[PDB]
Amino acid sequence: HAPLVDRLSALQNILSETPGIRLRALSWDAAGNRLQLDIAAVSSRALEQFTQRAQPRFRVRPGDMITKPDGIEGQLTLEEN
Amino acid sequence: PLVDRLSALQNILSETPGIRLRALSWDAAGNRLQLDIAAVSSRALEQFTQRAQPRFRVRPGEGQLTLE
């Protein structure tokens, strides 16, 4: 149960390593203590790279996704592993 | 960066006993932080509001505050 700031730093590192990804939004609440992310990815490869790179630090639960010819937009939930 | 802004917010909160953060949301389009907070007093809320400036602009909605 790491501090929120430490988990955000971890997320920043993961994002810095994955250039075909951008964070569009983030939400957190004290009761659930999970990070809900809306992400934009240039391709399915870039999204999977983000998902893999977030482990084993986090457990990743994908939400809904919208795939179009210009990229993928979707939601992911990160919880501590 | 979002992480730097959270760190800034943490510093503000650590200096303001009487304030608790219940939830937070950020989006790129507004480049904005929406906070659900609990304050023990109007006094504590005003101290938070003042301490958050000039780093952030504070827009008030227990309640919701928006920091940009």
Side-chain angles (χ1 to χ4, degrees):
Chain A
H1 306 275
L4 177 59
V5 171
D6 292 358
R7 281 178 278 167
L8 295 176
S9 311
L11 175 60
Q12 185 59 45
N13 292 336
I14 294 162
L15 291 171
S16 296
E17 293 190 26
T18 321
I21 298 294
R22 290 296 185 284
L23 186 63
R24 294 281 193 242
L26 177 155
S27 65
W28 167 89
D29 66 7
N33 192 27
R34 286 181 190 99
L35 298 178
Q36 180 68 9
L37 306 183
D38 283 21
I39 57 163
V42 299
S43 68
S44 58
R45 186 178 199 282
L47 179 57
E48 178 65 2
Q49 173 166 0
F50 178 88
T51 297
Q52 292 300 321
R53 182 62 181 76
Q55 309 175 50
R57 177 57 176 85
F58 297 108
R59 268 187 299 281
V60 183
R61 305 178 187 271
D64 293 330
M65 306 277 137
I66 311 306
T67 302
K68 300 196 176 180
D70 61 327
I72 300 174
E73 300 186 345
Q75 303 186 27
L76 301 181
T77 306
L78 303 180
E79 71 171 63
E80 287 169 294
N81 178 24
Chain B
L2 176 58
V3 171
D4 292 0
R5 280 179 270 173
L6 180 54
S7 192
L9 173 61
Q10 294 296 32
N11 292 336
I12 295 162
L13 290 171
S14 73
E15 293 189 25
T16 318
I19 299 294
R20 288 187 299 98
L21 185 64
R22 300 197 298 193
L24 77 80
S25 62
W26 169 88
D27 66 7
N31 189 27
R32 197 183 309 271
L33 297 178
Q34 190 170 7
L35 307 182
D36 283 22
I37 58 164
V40 301
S41 170
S42 185
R43 186 177 197 281
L45 178 58
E46 179 65 1
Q47 272 174 359
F48 174 87
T49 295
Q50 292 301 322
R51 189 164 290 158
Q53 308 170 356
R55 177 58 175 86
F56 298 106
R57 197 182 79 81
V58 185
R59 306 179 187 212
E62 300 190 326
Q64 305 186 26
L65 296 180
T66 302
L67 300 181
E68 70 171 63

